[model samples]
Target chain A: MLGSSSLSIRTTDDKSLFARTMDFTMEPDSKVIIVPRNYGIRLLEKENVVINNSYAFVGMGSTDITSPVLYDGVNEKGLMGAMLYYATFATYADEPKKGTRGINPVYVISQVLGNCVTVDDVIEKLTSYTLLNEANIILGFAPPLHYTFTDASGESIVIEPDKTGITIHRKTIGVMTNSPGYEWHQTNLRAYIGVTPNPPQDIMMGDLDLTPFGQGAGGLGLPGDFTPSARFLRVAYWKKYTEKAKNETEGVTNLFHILSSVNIPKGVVLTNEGKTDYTIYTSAMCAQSKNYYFKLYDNSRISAVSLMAENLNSQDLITFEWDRKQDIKQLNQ
Target chain B: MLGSSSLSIRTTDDKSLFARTMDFTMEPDSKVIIVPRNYGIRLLEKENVVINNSYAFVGMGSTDITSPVLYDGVNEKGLMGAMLYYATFATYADEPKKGTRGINPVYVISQVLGNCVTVDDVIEKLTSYTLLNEANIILGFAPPLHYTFTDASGESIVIEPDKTGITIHRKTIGVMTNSPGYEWHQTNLRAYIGVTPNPPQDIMMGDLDLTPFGQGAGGLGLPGDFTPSARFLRVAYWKKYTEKAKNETEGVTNLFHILSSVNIPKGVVLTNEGKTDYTIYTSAMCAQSKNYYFKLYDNSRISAVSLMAENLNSQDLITFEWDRKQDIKQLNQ
Candidate 1:
């Protein structure tokens, strides 16, 4: 019953706050998202790695053929996108010989992001391709997948493809998580409906009704555990407290702080096994600046990917060498 | 004189491996990227956090304005991003309208990404916004900054925008570092360009260029020293030696190993002032999965962010909580 939470800010013309709480099990694996400017996609394939810019290759569970899967990424043009583990919220059934081919879900995501530069382009290509279920990875079990798209205009959307077509949700709610579905989370909030921190005097007192301790002391019907039910309550509680930023820089900072709440670190009281396997990973995108900032638990070091730094005309994309060893002197005990 | 390196891989379609060699100062704090995501966008004034979906308030930074700065995170959407410190590669200018019309560069990146659905959308917005130079808070002087953006697509881009329009670069070499510039780093590679590993002309000569060094010793020019020149040589040598992956999982594994070669631990070496600050952090990202894995220096705990998890609609954005009272139990100990 390990849970995760996140908040999203829809600051287009109107200011809206979206939050989500979810159940999660941090799989022991490695992942990355890139936005290539030219014609290449890059990612990792394992957890304990020691190579520089190595290709992430996986053995297809069913097919002998090896396919490089690209998920979401930004191009040199400042285009950025991410693939989400929608689980049951959406579906991408295999299409037979429909010009769409089977690919690893991971790779499918990378390819969609590597080749296209915009959400519209992703939809176009996504609809034109068939998700080939040729691989049997942990996440490759054909888990329903969705995508979130963002750009410099400050506009964002969620791309959920189903057998009937694709459903584009104009990210009014910025929060997301793996679960039964997006709507289910929304509906779960109803349990806490009309419940506010400073509710009516009667509700706040709890004494008026003589609510039982541990039963309704805090609030009547408020989920008090970390289950999916409680997740909704907790997410709602924090979401209500956050404010909105005016730009990307402040937004990134705010996002990290908010995510920290949900980030599960090892030794933290874990619901499933009494220990957190993994916490959280985060990235900040400057749609307008075409800048991506990333961080991991093992490394306090931050990294960046800029769309404007690439030489797009070259047949082969130019790669730079990052001196990770030289610049950062670890502050260890 | 110390150096670090990054590793990157491009898939057959040129998507998947985006890694880098980071050469920087051993001490952090001098280098840190501000990655503002939607969380930052939403928490313009909030100061609370929820851990694993549990609600609580905590202190993070030194000031109220800096309270919610989320350096990194991965969303349920499987979108992972973070910020790295660039001791010499960044410049933040002063902004009188910070809380008003002006946006912080960090928040600029975060907010833009907060609502974006695709890399192209990010690029589109990049063309429309003006990075108000006057809006910097670092000592009232605007610091120069650069960024990196990636998605599950396995495509990645680096953006370094100054007063001029966006500067985009396609990283084919598979690495990055602070200082000089991406171009300068690329140019430095020429010194050891084309060097590769092969059967040594002599086996007994351990120090000999053509002698037997080990399994992967054929690649000569591995800089024996930690200097810019040596780092360039080292990066060039390792870039070709590390094996490549075709998926996010393998890519991240390889990236971790590659970065491990350059990871700086606090006690391993003394700082300029001869003090050990402890290992601040370590991180890894998978382009295809859009998952970022991390470990903190003092904590030595692993955490990850998945950009694809559904349920981000209600979690608080840019807020986090930690039970400081929690005891630190060593896994290996």
Candidate 2:
């Protein structure tokens, strides 16, 4: 269940919003955790220096802190970051860089959230670190990963680790999904250039008038499968045409609906071990409002856990259990 | 909108079922009509024919009595047929056969239902008639169509009309959609032969073992668009893998779910004139039970209007207005 999707959207009011769905074969014991300033994060690599940043952040991570890993999060400086599975494309160094820190693949999200405030800052900081394959022991094998970062400036960047080191993709369609690689996904978009929101016309085919059978004939070739490449195209097409929201509230709402289109229902996808690999949870964060919103697969009502509500100066790691009850809204007749 | 899909399925219990979606840019004033035995049907080419069988069928047609076209239907004899758009491939004769009847393209479904009881019967009877281009006056041009016929015996056949006359394709996957042609659609299925319900496995890439990101990776290339070829592949895949139902009740339920996957929603598709062309309705018929089930786009509740419920021996044409209201099932818990 490693199929995940992440995207960034900017509202008309300039509020940068980020959304993603966590799909996995098993639970990582994920929960919302608030890591305050001066909180130390030890890298899995033996010779790495501990990270103690000036900023505090809220992120989702496993309950076990043996090797603390933040899959996704937003920092106090309004910088949001998420790590999605990259499979065969992800590459890491066998040894640390000459003058930079050695960071494990699992620790990338935490390091980005704790230290970087903007996409530019992340790009600058990433040059000083070497992503190492230190996550294999706990994960049973090295878990390949890629990162997406965004800030209140409404700018976004995708960081992919390959044999040539980290390559940054800046001009993204504000979407990311697993496998094949971002470049392959981008190239795949060309196949769907003919896809549009418009309907087809009845044209003359010799003496007969050939007409489209129905709506969506224009998008007759948009990939609808759950594969990473397919999902990437689907998300890109919808994101490009979705009505823009005028405010942060509407933007966040729109983001969730867009994400919902790719959300996997349980039983629809099962792992080789016969275990279901469905979307365990979906999340969105507003950089301007500093609000972290999330909902589990069993529940749809959006719940917010704000960074402003936390003690940013505290040194301890605070955790919150996600409310998983189905929240059904009733209309008053 | 001219892209449409129709398929036939047979359960282990010898229960034959057929399902299809009527996709068009505009309504043909489609309705469910039962053409009783002994009723006369005048062909557009001045020739006339009288229905010899006492069979009640459900079909979509215009309000004009001069052009009573049946886009799709299932007769009381447990025979089902549908005419999907064929585009450049469909061809008709300039004149009627010497001893055979001259019939319009629009009335092909009525001809099949009124005369044939089985797919073999259809093959034998279709030799005596020529499909003419008589629908052009009302339609602005002749409608190109290919027919799919299935019987209680659980057999299916595809009939294509071309300059070489009617070509019968017997070895089909029991699926049909608008096309480049049925042969082209069949050939296109080879491209997706790699698609399967199985999950991908972890494979070694040099020193590293790479695993699939999540479920459904096996079907990574299954086309997700609304094109005729794409819909054909999608329906073929689902129909092949859908769990078999033991009886007609479960078979009809399964058929509806299969059709729903290919049904187009309005607004997602717009015609060149900016009009929405979507699936007006989806229908399924059980051969063993002689029950016809249908639902409009606005309504999801499966409404049953059985062929046996009407007077099959009547000499008049009977029509039923489709129930379009939402029917919510109440749960008392």
Candidate 3:
């Protein structure tokens, strides 16, 4: 299971940058896979028709997949998508209904990145398909997940499968985290309405002036724990108040720093099984440029590998190993 | 100005344990001084009467006088008192009243420890005197402060000097912290009335059962910051739910561990002057044994210096330097 944070920021230059942290107990052995155009894909259901996608995508996933299982990625058409853990709140259909396509939970991101170019495209395409509650045979269990889609147009959407079937929520705050549900996190934000960036001023009570002891008095009750609900509030507050970036480069840099506040260090959070649950890596994608940027826990220097740099017309998938070296630079004396 | 936390715990074995963290920008250069019985005492106010106290007290202060100036201490009668920073909310009388004995703001704790033997004694003594708004000439400012007192009878009281003279509050939660006022903190507690120790169980929303992601779901909204109001709520909740101790020794140990949640590291908090404001020391006093225990920020091993171990009948004041060495225990291989 995963507990994570995801957010989107719009720069002054009209560029959309999306970022998220992958928090789990152990590494998923994921690698960046470049899926080229015209790659034949078939759904994991009986009597399924094969369809070739028009757009190529770059995503991070395990090496055992015949088709790319993108947890997060951007397509050649400048559309970005991410799949975050939603656990027990997520529900999928037991099987595909007649005349509709059945898609495995692991292939939702791949399908979205393969065909959709915008949030509108994703919403329009949802009517003809159903996500199957099939086990991720590689991981031995069906992982519950939710999907978020955004494009350079600055529009975003979150899709969750519940008992009532697929529910789509307009991403007003452009923020998502593992939760009781999307509605619950949105309602929890009301409790922190008193939190602000401004320091409180001294006020007169009777004949006495009651002054604040220090700065950050306005943020007196901001939650500072690693819980998903607390993290949702923290990310929303910081993202709303952080300075606006001028371009994609500046936007991606600002996003990494903002994400650091929610990053978990090793040994600070441990599972009941005695294993450490920490942020394995953080990733950011620029929708306009189709550039995927990432930083591992061991190597924080930002690295980029864009979908535009890969051979989009090749049929075979190309994989790149993540660099895990310390890239610290020393000052010249 | 300062923001700090203080609390009192009454164990099932009839022992009252009091603990507080001294938070400020710099050290007050306080030392542990033992004032003996029959010592000649003088107040820092004009036209003050010379009074000889009936009981001796061992306390932490910086002055070398017959009357103790304690920030925290316990008396030979199993009564304990503490003075915490209350910032702008604390106000003292401009001068001595027409028929009352005026006492300096710095001498309020000293006066209470010198003559009072119980919470009742301290409350009764408040009707005949007023705290003078006199500056600590050595420190060059009149420090704003509030006092908390507890005795072997497990009774606690909080005294705040406000616009309406001295107002004494019965310590319902046996906790105090630097803030706007005691009443404000008490009212703020209602927001956290839903916080509990048990994890939330899975609940059904229609046909969907939403389970918690991890433990501590019940305390999801508890304030986790270092502000005075936040610290007040944190201490109250933890003190109320911590396991009950069987004796004074166990109680004191448990109290120190609980206080660790609120202790500040040096760089985490800084003043506008660029100086660090952190917890300089943490102290715990046992009312039933008249034993004062303390641990400096540099050394966390518990050290005890009791009023019963000193010469109570002497006519002069005795002082002990705080041992700041790191006390590490080695285990045999």
Candidate 4:
């Protein structure tokens, strides 16, 4: 139910960044979307009401966009967008339509970045729009998807939809995983409520006939090893124990360490027919430098997306596009 | 390294309570310091502080205050505080102070309730006064002693000291436990990141291998057993699935369910040498009533502690002195 890597780091740019390696296996439908680093963008549509961009890159896996190919594009304002994994958390219409145009959820990446400049704005509008779910291109129901949105503010937020409604838990933690739903993960922390560092035994004195230290005792039981509860306990313990930063740099480094506790192995996810559909998705936000760096697998290769405010007009969407081979080189370099 | 059989409950009034439990066989110098949930006021000399109002009531056991026992307490505003086992993590303390002037760490509870008003106040002044390590009363040592703090604002936080520094993670999840810090728990959610809740499994693309789903991909590799990690995962999973309320009444009820995930049996911590020390501590905070309720044990009888503004003040320190007759009546009642 979980797969993601998060890193809180301080980079050469002196910016505070939070990065997460996203890993998730789609249910009912087996689609793996991966966004390799270095792909630029080309704007296809640039209207205030609707914005779209395309990508040029090569990462394996079959999909309607392109199989084992490359693509990239940008909005009018130079905001870049890319898709990672055979991402199945998308929905698009299959039927012929007039009033309701078919829009791929993956493409929403470009549309969102092009039209919205802030995470708050993107989330606010996303919630307002009714997605075209019935005609999804993957030929099945779209797995409930959540997004990690970062903007020029150096702030990031996760947006997801559930049966109840869209609930947003602030991204102060700066990490996101696939699902059981984000709210569930938030609720799970309750079981490990009152843990402390370097604890003493016997916080709660139990029974006299049964107790040797009788009364005045507390903290007798500690979970033995690794389990969900133990992990929660340990993680909660570590989170409280770790360092704090006034800004985003150190936060990103700490985020990485936090993500290490739950990163899934590539071989862990497999298809019933045994197709190796596994990869991790990670994106880093540099608040000071105004850049986004992403990794598609365990490799060190990184894709960079920059938000250049000086290059475009207020309403004009700037754009960039890179070929597949160039992306690989840029990512490695 | 463990103990069990901790049980107790509190009522509307603060006066009546009882507890029976055991201590660990090992840690000889392990001491329990009384942390007054209040801030600023000190009991170092015996003249300055007076017990007036109480914050959330809590019970915890660790080598020292930094490695706190983490019990429950009430604030002057009528908010309640409680701690339960959520997951697991590690805890430790360095630069141990050999001799200092202060009340037994356990006595700090009465001091704080009788003194401070808010969690922020407690944070500001916890380390202002020092306790003599010679009078240390907690048992066992090996880190992983986390704490939970709750107030009438419906706000709860986990305070844990790790190798780094004291970091506080907001309590988005209601429960807390032994090891694995808070951030670790959040990251752990990635393990189950993209699991679907409905339609279970789809993806019948012609050739099964056309898009093989992948092996061992259905569930994130969360330990499905009782290890700390497993407990963390299980408890987290359950917490995510269950619904919760902001009000105190439902909060307490939800807190118990979280505790149930990691509660151990009597045989786990109790032995012929008497019961083990500091097995478990549970507390509840009622925001409306501004009352803090707690349970402590030594493997024998359940005892309770409640903090109210009526009688005690910040200076008066109290310990769990069991009155069996009242306890028996209360249990039956």
TM-score for each predicted model, relative to the true structure = 0.37, 0.54, 0.55, 0.35
Candidate 4 deviant stretches above 4 angstroms: A1-16, A24-103, A134-141, A164-173, A193-241, A244-254, A267-281, A294-333, B1-333
A1-333, model 1: which lDDT tens digit per residue? 134444454343333222222234553333332322343432223222211222211110111113233233444433455555554455555443456434434555455545555556666766655454333454445546665555434355666655565666653244455454555555555334323333222211101121122222223334444443455455544444456666666666666666555655556456455645344445455545555565555554556655455543444433322222324675994
Question: Which digits, one per residue and each the tens of the lDDT, describe model 4 over residues A258-279?
Answer: 5445544566656567754443
Ranking by DockQ: 3, 2, 4, 1
Q: iRMSD per model?
A: 34.1, 13.3, 11.4, 18.5
Q: Looking at model 2 chain B, report the run of 10 residues with the lowest lDDT sum.
A: B201-210
For residues B128-191, could you state the per-residue lDDT of candidate 1 as single tens digits?
4444454324333333555555544544455665444456665334455445556666655543
True contacts kept of each: 0.00, 0.00, 0.00, 0.00
List candidate 1 stretches off by more than 4 Å: A1-333, B1-67, B72-82, B86-101, B130-144, B162-165, B203-219, B224-239, B246-248, B267-279, B298-301, B305-310, B318-333
Which is superior by DockQ, 2 or 3? 3
Docking class of 3: incorrect
**Residue B325, candidate 1: alpha-carbon lDDT:** 38
Per-prediction TM-score, chain B alone: 0.64, 0.92, 0.93, 0.54
- Residue-by-residue lDDT tens digits, candidate 4, B298-325: 3223333444443443443344432324
Scanning candidate 3 chain B in windows of ten residues, the lowest lDDT window is: B200-209
Interface RMSD of 4: 18.5
Predicted structure 2: lDDT: 0.77
lDDT of 3 by residue, B153-172 (tens): 87788988887778888845
